[PDB]
Coordinates of C-alpha atoms and ligand atoms in Angstrom, one line a residue:
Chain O
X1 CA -2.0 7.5 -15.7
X2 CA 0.9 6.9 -13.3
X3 CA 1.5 6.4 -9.5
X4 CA 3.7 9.5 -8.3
X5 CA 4.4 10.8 -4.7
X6 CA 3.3 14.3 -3.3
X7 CA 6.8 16.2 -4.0
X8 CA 7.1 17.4 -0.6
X9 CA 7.2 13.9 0.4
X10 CA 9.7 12.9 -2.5
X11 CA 11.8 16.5 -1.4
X12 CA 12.6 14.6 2.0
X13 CA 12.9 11.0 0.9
X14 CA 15.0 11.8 -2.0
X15 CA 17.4 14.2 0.4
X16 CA 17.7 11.1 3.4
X17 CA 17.9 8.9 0.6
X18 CA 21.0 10.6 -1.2
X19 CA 19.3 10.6 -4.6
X20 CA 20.9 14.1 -6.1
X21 CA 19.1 13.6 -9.0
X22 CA 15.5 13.7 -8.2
X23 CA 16.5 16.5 -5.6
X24 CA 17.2 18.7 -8.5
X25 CA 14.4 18.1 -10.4
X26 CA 11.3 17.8 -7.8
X27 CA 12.7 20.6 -5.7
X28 CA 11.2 22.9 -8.8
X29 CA 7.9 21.4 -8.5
X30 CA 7.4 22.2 -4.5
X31 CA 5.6 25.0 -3.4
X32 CA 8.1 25.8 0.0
X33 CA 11.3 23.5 -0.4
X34 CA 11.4 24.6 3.2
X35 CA 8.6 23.7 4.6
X36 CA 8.7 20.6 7.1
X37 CA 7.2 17.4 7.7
X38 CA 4.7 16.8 11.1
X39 CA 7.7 16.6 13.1
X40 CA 9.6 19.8 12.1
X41 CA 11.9 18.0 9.8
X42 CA 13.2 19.9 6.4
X43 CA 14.9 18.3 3.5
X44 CA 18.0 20.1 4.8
X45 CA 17.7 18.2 8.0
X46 CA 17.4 14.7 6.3
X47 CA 20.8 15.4 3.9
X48 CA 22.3 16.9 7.4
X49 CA 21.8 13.7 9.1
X50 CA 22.1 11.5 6.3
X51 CA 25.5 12.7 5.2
X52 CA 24.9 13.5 1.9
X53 CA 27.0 16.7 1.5
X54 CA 26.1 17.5 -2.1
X55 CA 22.5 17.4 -1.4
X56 CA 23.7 19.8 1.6
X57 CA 25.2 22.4 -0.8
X58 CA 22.6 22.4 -3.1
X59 CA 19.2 23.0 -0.8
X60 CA 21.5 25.8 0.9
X61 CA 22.4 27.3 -2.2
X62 CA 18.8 27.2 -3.3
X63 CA 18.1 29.1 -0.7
X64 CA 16.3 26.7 1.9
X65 CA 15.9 28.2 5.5
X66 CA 19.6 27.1 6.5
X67 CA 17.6 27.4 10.7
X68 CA 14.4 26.0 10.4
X69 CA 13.9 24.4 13.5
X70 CA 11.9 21.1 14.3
X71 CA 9.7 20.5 17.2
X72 CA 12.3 20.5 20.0
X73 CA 14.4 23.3 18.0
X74 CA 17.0 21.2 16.0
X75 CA 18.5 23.5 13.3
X76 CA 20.4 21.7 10.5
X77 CA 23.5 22.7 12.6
X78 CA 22.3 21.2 15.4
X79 CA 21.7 18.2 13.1
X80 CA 25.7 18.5 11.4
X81 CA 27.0 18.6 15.4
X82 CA 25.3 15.4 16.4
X83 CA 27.1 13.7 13.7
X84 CA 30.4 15.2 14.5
X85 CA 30.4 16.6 11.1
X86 CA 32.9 19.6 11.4
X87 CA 33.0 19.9 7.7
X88 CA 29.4 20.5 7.4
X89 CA 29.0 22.1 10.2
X90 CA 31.8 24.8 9.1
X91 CA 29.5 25.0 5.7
X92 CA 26.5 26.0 7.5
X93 CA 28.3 28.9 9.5
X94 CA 29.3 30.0 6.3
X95 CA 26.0 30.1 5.2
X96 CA 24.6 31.6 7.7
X97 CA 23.6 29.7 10.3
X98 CA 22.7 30.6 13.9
X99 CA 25.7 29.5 15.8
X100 CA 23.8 30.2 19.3
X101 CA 20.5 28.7 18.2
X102 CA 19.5 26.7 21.4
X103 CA 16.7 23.6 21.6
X104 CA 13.9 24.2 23.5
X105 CA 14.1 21.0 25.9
X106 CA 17.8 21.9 27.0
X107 CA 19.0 25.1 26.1
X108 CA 21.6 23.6 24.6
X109 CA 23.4 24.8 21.1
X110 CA 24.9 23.1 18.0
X111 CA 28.4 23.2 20.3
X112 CA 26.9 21.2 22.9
X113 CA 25.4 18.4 20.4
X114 CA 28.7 17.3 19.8
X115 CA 28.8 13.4 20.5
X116 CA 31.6 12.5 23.5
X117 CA 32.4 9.0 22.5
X118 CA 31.9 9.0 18.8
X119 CA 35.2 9.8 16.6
X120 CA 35.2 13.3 15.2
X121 CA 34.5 14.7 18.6
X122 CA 37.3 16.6 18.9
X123 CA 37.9 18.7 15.8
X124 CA 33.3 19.5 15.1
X125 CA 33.6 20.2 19.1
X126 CA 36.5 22.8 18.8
X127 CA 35.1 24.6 16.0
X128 CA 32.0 25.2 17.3
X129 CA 33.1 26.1 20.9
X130 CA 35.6 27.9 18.7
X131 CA 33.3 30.0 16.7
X132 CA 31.2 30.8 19.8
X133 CA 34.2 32.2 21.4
X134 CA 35.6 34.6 18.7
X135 CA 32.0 35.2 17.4
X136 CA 32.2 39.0 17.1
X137 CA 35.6 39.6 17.5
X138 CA 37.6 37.2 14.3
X139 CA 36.9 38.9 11.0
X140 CA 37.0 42.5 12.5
X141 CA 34.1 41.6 14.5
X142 CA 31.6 41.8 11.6
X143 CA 28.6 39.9 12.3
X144 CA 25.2 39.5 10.2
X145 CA 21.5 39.3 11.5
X146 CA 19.8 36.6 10.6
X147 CA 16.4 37.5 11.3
X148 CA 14.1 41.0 11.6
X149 CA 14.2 42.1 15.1
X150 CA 11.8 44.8 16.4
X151 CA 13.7 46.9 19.4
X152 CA 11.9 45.8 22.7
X153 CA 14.1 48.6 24.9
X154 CA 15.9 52.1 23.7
X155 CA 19.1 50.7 23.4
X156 CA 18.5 47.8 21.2
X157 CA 19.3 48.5 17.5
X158 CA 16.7 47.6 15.3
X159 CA 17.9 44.4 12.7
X160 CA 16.7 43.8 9.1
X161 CA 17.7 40.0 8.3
X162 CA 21.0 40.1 6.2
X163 CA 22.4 43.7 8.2
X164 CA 25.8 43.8 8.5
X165 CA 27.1 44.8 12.1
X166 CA 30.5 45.5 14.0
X167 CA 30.9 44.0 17.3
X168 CA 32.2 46.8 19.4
X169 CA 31.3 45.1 22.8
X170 CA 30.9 41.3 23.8
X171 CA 30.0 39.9 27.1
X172 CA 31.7 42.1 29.0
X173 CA 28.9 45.1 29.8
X174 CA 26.3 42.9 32.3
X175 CA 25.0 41.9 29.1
X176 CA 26.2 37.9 28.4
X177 CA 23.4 37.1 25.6
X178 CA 23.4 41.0 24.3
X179 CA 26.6 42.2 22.2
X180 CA 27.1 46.4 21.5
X181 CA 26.8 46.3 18.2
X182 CA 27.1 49.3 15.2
X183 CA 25.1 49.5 12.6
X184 CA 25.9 52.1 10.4
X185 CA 25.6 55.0 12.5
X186 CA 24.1 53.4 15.2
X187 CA 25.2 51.8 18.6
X188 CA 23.1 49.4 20.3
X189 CA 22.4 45.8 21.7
X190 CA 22.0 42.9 19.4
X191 CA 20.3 39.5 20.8
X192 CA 23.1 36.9 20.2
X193 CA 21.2 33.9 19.2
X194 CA 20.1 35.7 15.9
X195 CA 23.4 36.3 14.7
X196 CA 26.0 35.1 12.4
X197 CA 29.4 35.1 11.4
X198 CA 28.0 35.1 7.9
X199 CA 24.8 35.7 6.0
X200 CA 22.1 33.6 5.1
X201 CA 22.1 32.5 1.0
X202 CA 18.7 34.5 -0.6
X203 CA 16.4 31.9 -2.0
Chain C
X1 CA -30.1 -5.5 13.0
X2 CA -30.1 -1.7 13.5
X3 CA -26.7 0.0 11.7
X4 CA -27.2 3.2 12.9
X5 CA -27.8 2.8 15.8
X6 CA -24.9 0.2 16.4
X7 CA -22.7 2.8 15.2
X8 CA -23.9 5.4 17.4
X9 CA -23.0 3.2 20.2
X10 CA -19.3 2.7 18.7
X11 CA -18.8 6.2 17.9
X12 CA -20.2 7.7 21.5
X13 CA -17.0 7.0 23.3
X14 CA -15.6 10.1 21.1
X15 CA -14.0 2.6 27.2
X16 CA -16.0 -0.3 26.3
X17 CA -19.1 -0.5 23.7
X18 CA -21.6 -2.6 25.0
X19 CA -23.2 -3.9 21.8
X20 CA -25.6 -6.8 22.2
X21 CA -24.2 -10.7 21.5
X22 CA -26.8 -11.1 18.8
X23 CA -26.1 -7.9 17.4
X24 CA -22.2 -8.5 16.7
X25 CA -23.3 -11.4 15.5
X26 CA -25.5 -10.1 13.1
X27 CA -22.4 -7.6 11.6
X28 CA -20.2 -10.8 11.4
X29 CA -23.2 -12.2 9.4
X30 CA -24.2 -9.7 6.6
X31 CA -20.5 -9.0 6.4
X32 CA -19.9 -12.3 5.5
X33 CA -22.3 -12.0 2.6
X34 CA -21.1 -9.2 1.4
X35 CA -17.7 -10.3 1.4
X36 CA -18.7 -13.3 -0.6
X37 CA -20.8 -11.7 -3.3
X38 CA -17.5 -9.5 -3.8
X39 CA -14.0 -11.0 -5.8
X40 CA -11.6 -12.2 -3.9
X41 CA -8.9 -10.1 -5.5
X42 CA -10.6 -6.0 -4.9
X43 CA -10.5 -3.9 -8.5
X44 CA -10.7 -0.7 -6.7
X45 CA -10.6 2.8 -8.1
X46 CA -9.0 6.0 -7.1
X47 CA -9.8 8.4 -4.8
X48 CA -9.1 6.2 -1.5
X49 CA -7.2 5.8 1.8
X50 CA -5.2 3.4 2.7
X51 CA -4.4 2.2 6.2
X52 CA -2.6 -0.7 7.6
X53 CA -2.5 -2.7 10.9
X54 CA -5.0 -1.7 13.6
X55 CA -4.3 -4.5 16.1
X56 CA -7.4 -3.5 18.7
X57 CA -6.3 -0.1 18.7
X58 CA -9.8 1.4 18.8
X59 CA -9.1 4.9 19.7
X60 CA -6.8 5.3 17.2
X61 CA -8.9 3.8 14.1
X62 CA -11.5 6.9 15.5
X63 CA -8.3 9.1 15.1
X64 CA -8.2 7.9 11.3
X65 CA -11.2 8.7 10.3
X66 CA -11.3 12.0 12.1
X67 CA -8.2 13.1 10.4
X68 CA -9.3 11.2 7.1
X69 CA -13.2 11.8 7.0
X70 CA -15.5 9.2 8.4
X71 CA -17.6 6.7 5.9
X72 CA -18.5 7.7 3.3
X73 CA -17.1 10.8 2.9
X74 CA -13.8 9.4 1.9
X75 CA -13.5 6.2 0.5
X76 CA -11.3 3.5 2.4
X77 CA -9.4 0.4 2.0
X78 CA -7.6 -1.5 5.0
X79 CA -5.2 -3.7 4.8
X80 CA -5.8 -6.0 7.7
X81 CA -4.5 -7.0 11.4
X82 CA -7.8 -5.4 12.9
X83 CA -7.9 -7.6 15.7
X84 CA -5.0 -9.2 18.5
X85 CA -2.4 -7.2 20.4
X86 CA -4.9 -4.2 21.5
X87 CA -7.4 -4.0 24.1
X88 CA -10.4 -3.2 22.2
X89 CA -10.6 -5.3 19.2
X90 CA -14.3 -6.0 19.5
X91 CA -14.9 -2.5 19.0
X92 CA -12.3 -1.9 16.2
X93 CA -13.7 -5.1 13.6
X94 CA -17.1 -4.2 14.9
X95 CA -16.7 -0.5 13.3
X96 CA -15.3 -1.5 10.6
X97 CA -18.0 -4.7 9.4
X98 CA -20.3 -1.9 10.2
X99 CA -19.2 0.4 7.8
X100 CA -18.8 -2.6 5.4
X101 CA -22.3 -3.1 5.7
X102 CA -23.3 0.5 5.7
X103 CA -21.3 1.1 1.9
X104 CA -20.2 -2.1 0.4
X105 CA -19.2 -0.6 -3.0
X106 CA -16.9 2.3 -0.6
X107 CA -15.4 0.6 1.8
X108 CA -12.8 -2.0 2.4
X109 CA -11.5 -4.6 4.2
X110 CA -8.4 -7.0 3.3
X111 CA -7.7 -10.1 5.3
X112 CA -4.6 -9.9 7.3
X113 CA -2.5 -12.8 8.9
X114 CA -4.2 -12.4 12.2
X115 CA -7.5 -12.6 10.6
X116 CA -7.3 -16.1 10.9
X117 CA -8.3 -18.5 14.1
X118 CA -5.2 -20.3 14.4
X119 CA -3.3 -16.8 14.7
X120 CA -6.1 -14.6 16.7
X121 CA -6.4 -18.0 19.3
X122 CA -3.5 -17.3 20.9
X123 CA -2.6 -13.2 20.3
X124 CA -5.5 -11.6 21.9
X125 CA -8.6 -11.8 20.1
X126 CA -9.8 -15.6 21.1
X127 CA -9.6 -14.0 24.8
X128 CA -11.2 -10.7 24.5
X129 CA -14.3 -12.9 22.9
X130 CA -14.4 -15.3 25.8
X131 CA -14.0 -12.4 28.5
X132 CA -16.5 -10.3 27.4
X133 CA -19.0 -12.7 25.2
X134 CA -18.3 -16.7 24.9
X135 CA -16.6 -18.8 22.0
X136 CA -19.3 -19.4 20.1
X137 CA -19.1 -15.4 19.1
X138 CA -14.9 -16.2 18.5
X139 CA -16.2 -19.1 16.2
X140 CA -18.8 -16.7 14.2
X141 CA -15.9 -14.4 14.0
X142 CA -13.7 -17.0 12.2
X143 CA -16.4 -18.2 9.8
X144 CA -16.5 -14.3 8.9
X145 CA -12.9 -13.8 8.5
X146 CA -12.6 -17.0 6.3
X147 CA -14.3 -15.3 4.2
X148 CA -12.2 -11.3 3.6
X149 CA -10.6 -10.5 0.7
X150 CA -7.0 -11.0 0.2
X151 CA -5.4 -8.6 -2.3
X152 CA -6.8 -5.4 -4.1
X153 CA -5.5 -3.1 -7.1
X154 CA -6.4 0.1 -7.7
X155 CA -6.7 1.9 -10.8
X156 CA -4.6 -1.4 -11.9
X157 CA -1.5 0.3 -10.7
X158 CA -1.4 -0.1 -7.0
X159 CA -0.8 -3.8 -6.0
X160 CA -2.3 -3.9 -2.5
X161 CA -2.2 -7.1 -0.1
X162 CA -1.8 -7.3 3.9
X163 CA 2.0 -9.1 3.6
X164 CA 3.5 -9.4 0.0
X165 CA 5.1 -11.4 -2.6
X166 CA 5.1 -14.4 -3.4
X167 CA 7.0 -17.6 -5.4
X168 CA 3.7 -19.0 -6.5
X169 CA 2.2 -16.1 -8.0
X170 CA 2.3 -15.8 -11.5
X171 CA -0.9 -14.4 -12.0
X172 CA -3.9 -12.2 -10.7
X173 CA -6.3 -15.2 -12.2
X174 CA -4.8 -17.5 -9.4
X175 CA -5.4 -15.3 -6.6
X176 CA -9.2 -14.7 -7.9
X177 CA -9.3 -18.7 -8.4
X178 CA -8.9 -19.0 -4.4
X179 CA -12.3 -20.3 -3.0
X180 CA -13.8 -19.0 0.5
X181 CA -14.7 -19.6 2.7
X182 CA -10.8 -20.5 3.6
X183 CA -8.5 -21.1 6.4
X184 CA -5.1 -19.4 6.2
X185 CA -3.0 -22.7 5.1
X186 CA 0.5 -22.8 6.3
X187 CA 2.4 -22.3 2.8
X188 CA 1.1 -21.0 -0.8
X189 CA -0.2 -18.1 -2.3
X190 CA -2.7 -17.3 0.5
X191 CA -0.3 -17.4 3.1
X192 CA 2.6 -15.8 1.2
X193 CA 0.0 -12.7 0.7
X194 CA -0.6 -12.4 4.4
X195 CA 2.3 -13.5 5.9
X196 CA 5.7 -12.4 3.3
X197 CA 7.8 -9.4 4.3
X198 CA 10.3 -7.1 1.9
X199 CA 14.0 -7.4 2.9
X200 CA 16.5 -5.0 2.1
X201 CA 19.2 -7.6 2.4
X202 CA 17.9 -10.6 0.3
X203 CA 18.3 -11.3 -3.4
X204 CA 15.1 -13.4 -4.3
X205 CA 13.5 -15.2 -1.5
X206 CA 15.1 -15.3 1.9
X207 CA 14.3 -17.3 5.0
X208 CA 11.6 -15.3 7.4
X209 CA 12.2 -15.1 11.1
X210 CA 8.5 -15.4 11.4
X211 CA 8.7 -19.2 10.8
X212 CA 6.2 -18.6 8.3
X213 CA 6.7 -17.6 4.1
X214 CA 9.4 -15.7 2.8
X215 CA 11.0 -12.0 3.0
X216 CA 11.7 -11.0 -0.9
X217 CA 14.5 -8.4 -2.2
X218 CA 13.9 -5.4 -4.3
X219 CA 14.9 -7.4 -7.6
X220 CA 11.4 -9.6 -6.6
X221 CA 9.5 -6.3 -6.7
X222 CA 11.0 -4.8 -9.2
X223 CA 10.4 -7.7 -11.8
X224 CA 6.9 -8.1 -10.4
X225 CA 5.7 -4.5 -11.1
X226 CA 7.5 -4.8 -14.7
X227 CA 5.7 -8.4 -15.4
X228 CA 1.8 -6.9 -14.5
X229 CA 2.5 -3.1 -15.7
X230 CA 2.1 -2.4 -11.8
X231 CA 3.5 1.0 -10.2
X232 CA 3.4 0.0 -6.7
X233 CA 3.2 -2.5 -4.0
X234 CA 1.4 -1.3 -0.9
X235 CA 1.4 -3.5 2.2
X236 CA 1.3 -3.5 5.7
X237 CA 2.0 -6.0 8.6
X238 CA 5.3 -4.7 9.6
X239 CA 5.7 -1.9 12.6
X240 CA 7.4 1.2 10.8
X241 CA 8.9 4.2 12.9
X242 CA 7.4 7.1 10.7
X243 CA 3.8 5.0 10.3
X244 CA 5.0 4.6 6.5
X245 CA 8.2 3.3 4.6
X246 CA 9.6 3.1 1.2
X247 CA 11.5 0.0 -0.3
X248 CA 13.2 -0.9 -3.5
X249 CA 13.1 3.0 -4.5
X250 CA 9.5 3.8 -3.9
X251 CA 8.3 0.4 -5.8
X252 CA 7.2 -0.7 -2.2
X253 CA 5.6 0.8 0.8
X254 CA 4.9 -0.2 3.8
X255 CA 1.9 1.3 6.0
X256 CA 1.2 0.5 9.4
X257 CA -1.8 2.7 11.4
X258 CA -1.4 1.8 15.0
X259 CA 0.5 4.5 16.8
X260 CA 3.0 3.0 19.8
X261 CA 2.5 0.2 18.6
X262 CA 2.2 -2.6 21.8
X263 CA 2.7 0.5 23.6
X264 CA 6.4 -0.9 23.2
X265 CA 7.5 1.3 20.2
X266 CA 7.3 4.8 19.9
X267 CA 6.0 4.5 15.9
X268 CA 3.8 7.0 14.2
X269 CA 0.7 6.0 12.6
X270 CA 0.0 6.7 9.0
X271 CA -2.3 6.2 6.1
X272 CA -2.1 7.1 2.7
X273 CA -4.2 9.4 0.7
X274 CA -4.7 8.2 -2.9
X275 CA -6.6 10.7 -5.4
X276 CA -7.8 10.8 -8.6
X277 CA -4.6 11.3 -10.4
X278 CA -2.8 8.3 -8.7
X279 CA -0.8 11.4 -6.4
X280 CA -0.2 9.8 -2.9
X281 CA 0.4 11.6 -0.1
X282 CA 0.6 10.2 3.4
X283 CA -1.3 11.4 7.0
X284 CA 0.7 10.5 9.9
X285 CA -1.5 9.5 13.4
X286 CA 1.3 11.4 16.1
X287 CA 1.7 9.3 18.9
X288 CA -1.3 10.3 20.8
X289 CA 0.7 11.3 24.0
X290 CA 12.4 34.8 14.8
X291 CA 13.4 32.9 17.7
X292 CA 12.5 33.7 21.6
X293 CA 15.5 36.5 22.0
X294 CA 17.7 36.3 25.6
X295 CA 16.3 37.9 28.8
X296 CA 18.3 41.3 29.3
X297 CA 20.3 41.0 32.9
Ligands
LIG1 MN1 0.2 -6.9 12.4
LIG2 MN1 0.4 -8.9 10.0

């Protein structure tokens, strides 16, 4: 009979910690790698924040909820912009993460997280700000839901999480927040902050 | 001396406990017994919680047992610092002795470095006893903390002790060997074991900014858990952001249970849940104080 730690709790240590090698084992022996601690925090947050890039990759291409969001609505890629970590940051947009997520306290996205005074500023700043500008227009304006979304009005279109959309109209119709999309045969307003330039990795 | 009733009083503010002079004198009493007819070193079994420093934080300790299920219904070991800092320390150690009383064999107290009258003179707890009682209480206090438990293992895997290490242990024979009723002395095994701190920056013993013992590297804890087949060190006495911390790759841990802390820090609160199976899991005491889509425009 031996001492051993809950494996949620050894899931986060072992991700802020930077110890690959337990992550790949104990991950298999949680219930919801995704699920946080009392705060909100995921594994993915602590190897966000921690720097630990492998760890990063792996929990995302598990399948981990690449946007969970803590108590004050940190996503992971609110996490990678604090740090002024372009290269993660680009890593999680590629995996589908919700480049206009906003926190709850502020309103403010991944873009605006972006440290002033500490070095890396420049580069993680201009990507994000970058992506939120050509959001719907690069890459033939395809864009991906990242969530199920219900239509609350008659010209929203209805989104399954992982649908694959062409911007036909950004920002320019009265609508800042609500992009004409196409779906198929369909025409209709998409809520931005659900969106991303790619789609989420299926766990 | 009526327990229940005592208790009663203690638990109604779920503000000060007015509990009669003779009365707390009477917990600090058959405490005392008790703790003397106990060892000195605690051979504790699984299931159990854990909690570290309390430091007069009375409302919180009710938070505890709330979230961890009052005496008896869960078993409990603390690891000291019940009294000093906090403004209600009288109730805290009062609640505690209490339950000692009430379930000797299932509950448990460890002597921490300010369980000690040199320590508790000048921190807090020598003045809350002459505000609200006189010295003579303080000094029936002191003859009852000489006499706490210093160290416990459970399931002889969990090393459990208010501070840590220390360069003159060798063996659990010469902790049992320590005779109460005892002052806190100011260097040896006693102290060390109330009074050391891990350090991730020392090899062996380093100097402690405490004035007092030493702080010990992971090597120390590491050869320590090797030499007495341990698995784990679990200690307290040091203020920790998330209420617990690991050290020297989960060999150590670090529990503290007062939330803000001083009201200076912004620390969580934990305490950790120890079952049957040796699988710990930790509660944390929160400092007591598809997304929303756009708006269309
Ligand atoms: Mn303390
Ligand atoms: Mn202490």
């Amino acid at each position: 009979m031996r001492v051993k730690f809950n494996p949620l709790a050894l899931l986060l240590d072992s991700s802020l910690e930077g110890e690959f090698d337990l992550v790949q084992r104990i991950i298999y022996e949680v219930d919801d790698p995704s699920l946080p601690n009392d705060e909100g925090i995921t594994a993915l947050h602590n190897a966000v924040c921690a720097g630990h890039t492998e760890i990063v990759k792996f929990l995302v291409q598990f399948g981990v909820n690449v946007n969970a969001a803590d108590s004050d609505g940190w996503t992971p890629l609110h996490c990678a912009a604090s740090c002024n970590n372009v290269q993660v940051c680009k890593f999680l947009v590629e995996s589908g993460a919700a480049v206009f997520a906003m926190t709850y306290s502020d309103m403010q996205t991944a873009a605006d997280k972006c440290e002033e005074m500490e070095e890396g500023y420049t580069q993680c700043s201009q990507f994000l700000y970058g992506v939120q500008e050509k959001m719907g227009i690069m890459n033939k304006g395809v864009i991906y839901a990242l969530w199920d979304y219900e239509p609350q009005n008659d010209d929203e279109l209805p989104m399954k999480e992982g649908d694959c959309m062409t911007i036909i109209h950004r920002e320019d119709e009265d609508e800042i927040e609500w992009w004409w999309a196409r779906l198929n045969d369909k025409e209709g307003y998409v809520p931005r902050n659900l969106l991303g330039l790619y789609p989420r990795i299926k766990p | 001396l009526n327990l229940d009733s005592i208790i009663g009083r203690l638990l109604e503010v779920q503000k000060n406990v007015q509990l009669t002079e003779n009365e707390i004198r009477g917990l600090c009493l058959k405490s005392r017994e008790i703790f003397l007819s106990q060892p000195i070193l605690l051979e504790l079994e699984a299931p159990l919680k854990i909690c570290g420093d309390i430091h007069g934080q009375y409302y919180d300790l009710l938070r505890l047992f709330e979230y961890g299920g009052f005496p008896p219904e869960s078993n409990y070991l603390f690891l000291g610092d019940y009294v000093d800092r906090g403004k209600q320390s009288l109730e805290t150690i009062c609640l505690l002795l209490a339950y000692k009383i009430k379930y000797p064999e299932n509950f448990f107290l460890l002597r921490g470095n300010h369980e000690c009258a040199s320590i508790n003179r000048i921190y807090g707890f020598y003045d809350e006893c002459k505000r609200r009682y006189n010295i003579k209480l303080w000094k029936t206090f002191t003859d009852c903390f000489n006499c706490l438990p210093i160290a416990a293992i459970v399931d002889e895997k969990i090393f459990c002790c208010h501070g840590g290490l220390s360069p003159d242990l060798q063996s659990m024979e010469q902790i049992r060997r320590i005779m109460r009723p005892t002052d806190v002395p100011d260097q040896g095994l006693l102290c060390d074991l109330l009074w050391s701190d891990p350090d991730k920056d020392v090899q062996g013993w380093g100097e402690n900014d405490r004035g007092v013992s030493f702080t010990f590297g992971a090597e120390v804890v590491a050869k320590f858990l090797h030499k007495h087949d341990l698995d784990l060190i679990c200690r307290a006495h040091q203020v920790v952001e998330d209420g617990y911390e690991f050290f020297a790759k989960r060999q150590l841990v670090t529990l503290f249970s007062a939330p803000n802390y001083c009201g200076e820090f912004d620390n969580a609160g934990a305490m950790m849940s120890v079952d049957e199976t040796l699988m710990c899991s930790f509660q944390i005491l929160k400092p007591a104080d598809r997304p929303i889509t756009p708006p269309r425009n």
